[PDB]
Structure formats: C-alpha cells, structure tokens
Amino acid sequence: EQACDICRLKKLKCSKEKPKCAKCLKNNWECRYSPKTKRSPLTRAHLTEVESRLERLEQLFLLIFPREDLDMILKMDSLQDIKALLTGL
C-alpha cells in the first residue's frame, strides 16, 4: 500500500517495488518509505479526555483572570505572547 515519499509529495502512482521504484529509479532519485506519522487517537474517549481537561483549565483560569483574557490565550501561538500575557498580571 505505502507510496514512496516523493510519489506522495508529487501525487503520481507509485510502482512501490523493492528497494526503489520506477520514477525514483528512472528519474534518478533516492526513493524512501518514511514511517507513518504518530497522531493522537481519534476516539471518542480521547476527544472527551481532552475536551474535558480543556474545560476545567478554562474554569480555573476564570477564577484568576478575566474572561476577555481567556479568549486571547485560547488563540495565541507564540510562547512570548503567552508569557507576557501573564506578566501584565
């Protein structure tokens, strides 16, 4: 089943043979089969672990700071910004 890295990236049929394969072989490229990427399980128990801890950190957050701040953090991607937020106390 697994297509080689390059065929994946390019989205063309892979011959998939061993070691290399038609277009990496032909075209002159180093053909690889990368490991599947580890992702979190998409189960319902796990979505619920995570929604319900996020909820409880939100509940605790609100005893400490205003709701308007909740909404800012819940969007920040930068670690300086998450820290500065906290520094304006």
Partner: protein, 895 residues
C-alpha cells in the same frame, strides 16, 4: 593605598580611554597607538573631553571608573563611564545621528541623574570655546557611589583556545581550540543592551534599552530587603565583586560589610521574559575571616578578589582569594576558598594556602586569559595561572617534560620574556598589564604622556632557543584573533627581540621570521600546501590583513629588502581585488534592475537611478590607471633581470610570480574585466549618449595599454602548470612558503630559477615594445616604505637600549605632527591624485598601522564627478570609513 584598578580601559579596537585628573578643562582622554616611520611607534594626540551631569542642555565632577563594553563577544564601542557622584554617562563612538563616523569621535545616548533620551554629538575641549566649567571635586562617597560595574553579554557564543603542546612525534607544536558556551547572565536579542551596577549603599541598578524603542528604562532595588529603612541605608560595602556563576541568570554578589565584619554572599536572579525583566535577590551565606596563621602571625585582609570562573575548569566554584599580609614580614598569604553546596549522607571549603615573598599592591584579572596578576612592591609581576597556580614565567623549568604532551605553552610569557625594572608604584598613578601580557602600561605623575615597557630576554646570545621562541609568539596571536583583539602590544615586543638578533647576525634574524609565521598556519589549521580549493578561502580570509601586516612591521628595519614589499603588493592586490570584483557583483545586479523598471520612465526616482548607473563606472578609471601601472613594473624587472641574474636586490620578482593564488586572482580579474566589457558591449547606454564616455573610456584604456592583456594572461597561466608538475616530480611543502612569503627559491632548486629568466623573454615581450617599457614612468607606485614616510624621519631615532616606542616630544619640531609624517600626494584606495582642495579641507584619513593616507568615506568634490553638480552621492569609499586596507583603524587627520 589601593591603585586605580578601573581608571583605564583598553577597548578591544585599540582606543585607550583613561581617567584624567590633572587638566582643569577635561576629565577624560582618548588616544591610541600609531606607527612613526614603520619601525618605531608613538601614542596618538590626546583627545580631551569634559563630562558634566548637565550636558543635556555648570560644574563637572571627577571620573570614578571607565568600562569599555569589551566583555565576551560584545562589539566594544559603547563606553559607559560612571562619575564620582554616581551618574552613569553612556558614550557611543563610531556613530553619528545622521551618518557613520570614525572611532575617535564620540556621541551620547542618554544621561542618568530619572533617565531621559537626548542624542547629541560631543566635541573636543580644545576645539570648543572657553566655557564656564570648573573642576568641582565630589570628595563625598554617596549612597549612589557605584562600587563595581559589570556589563551583560548577548546570546552569541565565543570560540577561543586553551593551550598548546609540543608533539614530539612530529616535532611540531599542536594547539586545540574549544568553544566556550555563554555562562552567567546574558541578555536576549530583543533587548539592545543591559548593564548592572552596585552602589556603595547596597542599592542596585539595571539599565536596559529596548531594540524597538529609544526610551530607556531603569529598575532599582536594595540588597538588604528588611522591613526597616534604618538598616536599608546602612550596608556600606567595602568590596562588592560580582562573579557570574553557571547557575542560570545568577550572579554571586560577594560583599564584605565591615558593619558585621563578615564576608556575606548573595544571589541575584533575573527573568528576561515585551515585559520588563523581573529582579530577585536571595541571601545565601556569611563567614568570618581567619585571624591568625599556623605559626602564630596575625593577618589583615588587604583585598578580596574573586575570579570569574566558567564551567570549563574542573571545579567551577569561584576562587575567593582573600589576601592577607603578615605584618613586619615580607611574606604575603593568599588563602583560597570555594563555595559549594552542602551535601547529605552551602559551605566554604578551604583548599590550600599560598605564600608570596613580596607584598601585593594591585590585583587585575585578565580577560579571556584566566590569569591573576600580582603587582608586587618592587615592580615585578608574577602572573599565576588559574588552573594550577604555577608561575607562568618559570613553568618551563619546573615542567615534567616526560609524558604524551610536552612543553605546554599558553603565552609568550612562558618562554621567559620578563618585564624590566618598572617604576615604583608610589610614583605611578595606575598600571595595567597589556592584554597579551607582552608589556605593561604605566602612567606617571610628571609624564604628560603614557609610557610603555616591553619584555626582555637575558639569554639572547643562545641560538638553540629560537625554535621555542618563534612558536611561543606564534600562539600569542592565535588567542588574540579569536578574541578579536588588535594585539598591537604583542607586535612591538616581537620586533625588539628581532632587532637585537639582527645587530649581531643579520642572516639569523631572517630565518626567525620564516619559522615564526609558519606556525601560525599550523595552529589555525590552514595549509599553504593544500589543494587549490582551500586557496580561494585564503584570499577572502581576514587574517591576511593582519598576519601579512606582521612582517610589514617586523621587516621594516631591513632596508632594500623584499620581505615587506612582497606582503604589501599582495595586500594591495587585495585592495585591488576589492575594487573590481567588489563592484563586479554590484554592477551585475544593475542589469536586472533596468528591465523590470522600464515601465515608468517619467518617475523622479528613475532619473537619479539612471544617473548613478553611469557615475559609478567613472570612479573605476583612477583605479585602473594603477592597475596598468602595476603590471608594467613587474614586466620592466623581467628585462633588467635577464642581463644580471646575480643581483640579489631584485629578488622580489621571483616571489610575485611564484604566488599560486595571485596568478589565479589576476586571471579572475581579467575574467571579470572581459565579462564587464562583454556585458557593457551587450548592454550599452542608449538613452543618453553623453554618459557613454565612461563606458567608452573603459574599452579604450584596455586597448591602449602598452602590453596586451591577452598575451599577459597566457603568461601567468603557463607558470601555474609548470609549477604544478614540479611538485609531482619531487614532493616539497617549503616551496609553497618560499613562493608566497620568502619571495626566494631555495638553493636546492637553483635550476628552477633559471627557467623564469629564459622563458619570460620570448613569451610576452615579443608582442610589446621593449624600448617603451624600459623607459616607462612607473615611479610613484607607493610599494616601498621609503616612499611612504618622509625622508626626515625614515631612520632609527633612538638606541635599542632606550626601547622601541618614542615619545612625541623627542621628534623634530617640523616632524611633530601627523601631517609631516607621510607623503600626502597620492590616494591609496581609489588610486587617484590628491588636489590641493582635498588636502586642505581636513576630511582625509590616515592609517595608524601602515602610514597610508586616504580620503575614503567622504563625499567627493564636484570636479571629480562626471558633471559638476551639487548632488551628493555615497561612493564605494564608504566601505573603509573605519577600517583601513590593512585592517588598521582610520582616523581624522589633524590640521
């Protein structure tokens, strides 16, 4: 009384800023080292300035300490001086509010009293009008009196070397360089800078500036964070030494309060993460000092110096060196303590006691060297290494020679170069060992100028020690380049020893240079016998601007010798390299700008863009004249050498062709010249025919040259191939050094020398005018040193016993200014004649190293432009505003 440990500071760029306490109109002075006549040296004219708290819009106060920001990897240009009142005045040099300036002109950033921003360029006192400022003496030690000032480094890493050892297997010295990760407290990039100061009352300060703003901020605390202000204002700290520790964001504030008679320890913590950094303090430990020794003699604490120790050493705990003197006895005891955590199954553990036979009057810690200097009463200095506290000047005698690594050398002081009889400390205002430990700076009460003392060696008549000495001085520069130090002190010391050698045997001194510079290549892992790929890296390398400068000074005394001439022509060819290939890349990008910006012709931005395109090529014409004038000189020597091959005074011609990268370098210059001409022919100027003169002149000067470039191109190409097959015929690596530095052919290769004479005649001269080239006027090339300095001073002025450095007062009356030192006739960067207007305007610069004079970095007059106009254009000479061609510093020439 304790000496002025921080009265003077040698900036990493060579500027010597020291406190002034005698002039009634100034409190600070600036100076630097410059070469008199290529052999001797003298300090520059003192640039006096006055510092008072009210520069922002009148009495001025004395200067307490001067701290250049040369710590770690900092640029070392921002000088912050703290006065006796406690005000911290920050001065930035090398920058102006509107433009860039040289390193001898100051500028303010902000003044502290509350802090406010006020940018203002300072002016010298002598040039300024007589002002109503009197020297008010603040003889009171205020609560805000700063005890110790410390700078904060950035996140950059520093790579230095620790030591070298003699590899007896290969009979050569080998050195290893270890990268030093930052330790202690470092400020993040988004903060422009930060600094810390401890005041005598215990109040701390933290100045910092945000990189995205101009406003400055200050945060202050107090050490004794008690609930009562009664004890807050009591901590009169006798000694407050701040030593950063490997703990993150921690500084060990080792203080000695005489109120409680204990050496109290503290810890300071800072959280960088745009919010202001938070400062925290935590008390740790306090101990009492020992009253007596083992035999029953009481002790007195003279000084408390703690060493700034990194994590490299075996035990990173800082050494608290509490000095004690046995009264009425010449002995002096230095007890050593270390701070360590208390372990279960903090505290101070005593390691050992060290006895010194003379009383100590000053202690100074070296930077990036790990050397404690004991300035005894009799003037002698015994620098003990931090690793083992073994005397550096006597380590060779007591070294265990047997072992894997033999003859461990860290500095030229290990060889035996000891300082002479220094002036007694009572007469001395302040001392400071030079950064390379080659000499000591002494400021005298009755001497209006700084003195200088170099190291001497008693056994100069023994020839067998030349092998060790050359290697020892070779490693001295290795540490200096890694720390970006000018190392002008080390250059003076090397020349004095060579001069004493040449007085007895001139032949011996020449070999000393060759062996000395050879070890530099081995230490830095650069090989002149390597394949051609590394050779390209060599040409662009900064060290050649300095290592070649070494023989430029170490070979100056040898008149009619080609050691300095060979280095200068290669060095000037590098300047020639920066001319064409420096603009060939710039001109290439201008081709693409034409096509993409052809859709808007009437815009007011294209017209200035079009004008600048054809103006740049005009300034290359004066450079090309010296380019042609240079190749004719070597061709002229070909005809002369054929008749008389036995003339040793004309051996420079051999080395020039022997250099391997020079043949390729000229070929590359000829390659881009062909490319530029082909591109200009392919893409000529069509909108304005009047602007085609510069483009047309470029074609004409090449065709009208007395010798065809194509014939000369094949000349150097054939030499490379013949010199490569000879390497395969017999393997040898000294010939690579000989063709590059010695500019000679070894006697074992005498047959090779005959080939150059015979083949050069029929190759290129057959296509040129023989009669014309011989009588051609190639004079004024500024190649020899004799035609750089004026003939009045181009000689030795004082005997070698009196030293090599000369005070200005001994110079002739007409030769006591920098204007009379050199020939101010020709330019050195653009290779253009200097008119009377450019001479008299005082906007030209002189190099303190090689004596060169250049008006680079300034707007050119309208008569030198393509068309006389008042439009100001920033020309390429702006690259050398602060750095000369030989990596020396450029300064405004005094009028």
């Amino acid at each position: 009384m304790m000496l002025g440990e921080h009265l003077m500071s040698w900036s990493k760029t060579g500027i010597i800023a020291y406190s002034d306490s005698q002039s009634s109109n100034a409190n600070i002075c600036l100076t630097f080292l410059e070469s008199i006549n290529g052999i001797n040296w003298r300090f520059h004219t003192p640039q006096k300035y006055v510092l008072h708290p009210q520069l922002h819009e009148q009495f001025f106060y004395n200067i307490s300490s001067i701290h250049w920001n040369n710590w770690f990897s900092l640029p070392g240009d921002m000088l912050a001086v703290c006065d006796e009142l406690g005000n911290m005045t920050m001065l930035i040099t090398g920058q102006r509010p509107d433009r860039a300036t040289t390193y001898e002109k100051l500028t303010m950033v902000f003044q502290d009293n509350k802090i406010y921003n006020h940018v203002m360029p300072l002016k010298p006192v002598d040039k300024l009008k007589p002002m109503n400022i009197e020297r008010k003496q603040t003889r009171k030690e205020y609560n805000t009196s700063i005890l110790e000032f410390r700078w904060l480094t950035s996140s950059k890493s520093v790579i230095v070397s620790q030591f070298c050892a003699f590899d007896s297997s290969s009979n050569t010295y080998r050195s290893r360089a270890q990268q030093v990760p930052p330790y202690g407290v470092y400020h993040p990039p988004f903060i422009k800078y930060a600094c810390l100061a401890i005041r005598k009352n215990g109040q701390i300060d933290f100045w910092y500036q945000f990189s995205n703003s101009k406003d400055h901020k200050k945060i202050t605390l107090q050490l004794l964070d008690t609930s009562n202000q009664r004890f807050k204002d009591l901590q009169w700290l006798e000694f407050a030494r701040i030593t950063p520790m490997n703990d993150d964001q921690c500084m060990l504030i080792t203080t000695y309060s005489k109120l409680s008679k204990n050496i109290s320890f503290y810890k300071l913590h800072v959280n960088w993460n745009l919010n202001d950094p938070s400062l925290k303090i935590q008390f740790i430990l306090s101990t009492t000092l020992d009253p007596t020794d083992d035999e029953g003699h009481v002790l007195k604490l003279e000084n408390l110096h703690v060493v700034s120790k990194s994590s490299i050493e075996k035990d990173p705990s800082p050494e608290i060196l509490v000095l004690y003197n046995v009264c009425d006895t010449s002995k002096s005891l230095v007890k050593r303590y270390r701070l360590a955590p208390t372990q279960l199954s903090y505290n101070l553990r005593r390691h050992s006691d060290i006895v010194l036979d003379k009383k100590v009057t000053l202690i100074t810690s070296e930077m990036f060297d790990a050397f404690v200097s004991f300035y005894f009463e009799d003037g002698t200095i015994e620098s003990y290494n931090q690793n083992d506290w073994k005397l550096e000047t006597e380590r060779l005698i007591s070294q265990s020679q047997l072992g894997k690594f033999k003859n461990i050398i860290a500095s030229p002081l290990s060889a035996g170069f000891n300082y002479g009889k220094l002036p007694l400390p009572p007469s001395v205002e302040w001392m400071k060992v030079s950064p390379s430990m080659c000499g000591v700076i002494v400021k005298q009460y009755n001497k209006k100028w700084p003195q200088f003392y170099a190291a001497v060696q008693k056994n100069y008549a023994d020839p067998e020690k030349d092998s060790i000495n050359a290697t020892a001085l070779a490693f001295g520069y290795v540490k200096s380049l890694h720390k970006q130090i000018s190392a002008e002190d080390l250059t003076i010391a090397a020349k004095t020893h060579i001069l004493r050698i040449s007085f007895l045997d001139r032949k011996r001194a020449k070999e000393f240079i060759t062996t000395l510079l050879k070890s530099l290549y081995s230490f830095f892992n650069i090989s002149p016998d390597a394949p051609k790929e590394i050779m390209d890296k060599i040409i662009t390398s900064r060290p050649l601007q300095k290592i070649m400068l070494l023989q430029l000074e170490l070979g100056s005394c040898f008149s009619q010798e080609n050691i300095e001439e060979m280095a200068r022509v290669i060095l000037y060819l590098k300047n020639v390299l920066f001319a064409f290939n420096g603009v060939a890349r710039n001109f290439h990008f201008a081709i693409e700008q034409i096509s993409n910006n052809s859709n808007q012709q009437q815009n007011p931005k294209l017209f200035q863009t079009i004008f600048s395109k054809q103006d740049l090529i005009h300034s290359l014409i004066p450079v090309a004249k010296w380019f042609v004038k240079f190749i004719t000189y070597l061709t002229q020597e070909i005809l002369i050498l054929i008749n008389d091959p036995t003339n040793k005074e004309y051996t420079l011609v051999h080395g020039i062709f022997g250099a391997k990268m020079s043949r390729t370098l000229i070929l590359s210059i000829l390659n881009e010249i062909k490319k530029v001409t082909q591109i200009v022919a392919k893409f000529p100027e069509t909108s304005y025919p009047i602007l085609n003169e510069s483009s047309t002149f470029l074609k004409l000067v090449l065709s009208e040259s007395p010798v065809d470039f194509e014939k000369f191109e094949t000349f150097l190409v054939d030499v490379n191939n013949k010199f490569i097959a000879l390497c395969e015929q017999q393997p040898s690596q000294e010939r690579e050094f000989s063709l590059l530095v010695k500019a000679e052919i070894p006697p074992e290769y005498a047959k090779v020398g005959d080939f150059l004479l015979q083949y050069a005649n029929n190759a290129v001269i057959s296509h040129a005018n023989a009669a014309a080239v011989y009588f051609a006027d190639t004079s004024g090339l500024k190649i020899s040193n004799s035609e750089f300095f004026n003939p009045e001073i181009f000689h030795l002025l004082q005997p070698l016993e009196e030293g090599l450095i000369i005070d200005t007062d001994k110079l002739p009356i007409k030769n006591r200014t920098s204007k009379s030192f050199s020939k101010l006739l020709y330019d050195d960067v653009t290779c253009d004649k200097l008119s009377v207007s450019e001479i008299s305007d005082g906007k030209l610069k002189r190099c303190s190293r090689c004596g060169s004079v250049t008006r680079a970095g300034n707007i050119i007059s309208s008569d030198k432009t393509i068309v006389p106009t008042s439009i100001q254009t920033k020309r390429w000479p702006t690259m050398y505003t602060r750095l000369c061609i030989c990596s020396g510093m450029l300064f405004e020439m005094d009028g």
